[PDB]
């Protein structure tokens, strides 16, 4: 009863404590968001030459099942002319967000093999029924 079509509203705010990924420069970071293993895959812009990138980008991702869905956040380094250079990732269970609540917090990204630190990323997440205003508490 009372079937709802939930959406994941996610603001990829900023990150800090990113690793130096090459001999020169600092980090040219962007985040990749993926729901489950689906083709709902989104990318932020690249912020060049900083360990403290600020994206402040919002994405609106339709959900399949709020009791089991997972958001994976991959942090990677741009490598022009070559493939993305992976930094770190985290898998976030959608079922841990109180429905309708706006949760702003920092997440500890797990560095991949060979990477000296993973960084921390700030996300504002709101799991909201369709029709509710994004990023405002839903009553
Ligand atoms: Cl798909």
Automatic annotation (TrEMBL):
Keywords: Calcium, Metal-binding. GO terms for molecular function: calcium ion binding. Residues 5-107 form the C2 domain. GO terms for cellular component: membrane. It comes from the Eukaryota. This is C2 domain containing protein. The lineage of its organism: Eukaryota, Metamonada, Parabasalia, Trichomonadida, Trichomonadidae.
């Amino acid at each position: 009863h009372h079937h709802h079509m939930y959406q994941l509203h996610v603001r990829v705010v900023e990150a800090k404590e990113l690793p130096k990924m090459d001999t020169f420069g600092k980090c040219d970071a962007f985040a990749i968001l993926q729901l489950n293993s689906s083709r709902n895959i989104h990318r932020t812009k690249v912020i060049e030459k900083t360990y403290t990138p600020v994206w402040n980008e919002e994405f609106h991702i339709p959900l399949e099942d709020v009791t089991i869905d997972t958001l994976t956040v991959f942090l990677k380094d741009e490598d022009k002319g070559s493939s993305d250079d992976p930094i770190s990732l985290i898998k976030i269970p959608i079922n841990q967000f109180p429905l309708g609540e706006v949760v702003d917090k920092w997440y500890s990204l797990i560095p991949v093999k060979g990477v000296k630190k993973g960084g921390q990323i700030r996300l504002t997440i709101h799991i909201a029924p369709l029709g509710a205003t994004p990023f405002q508490k839903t009553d």
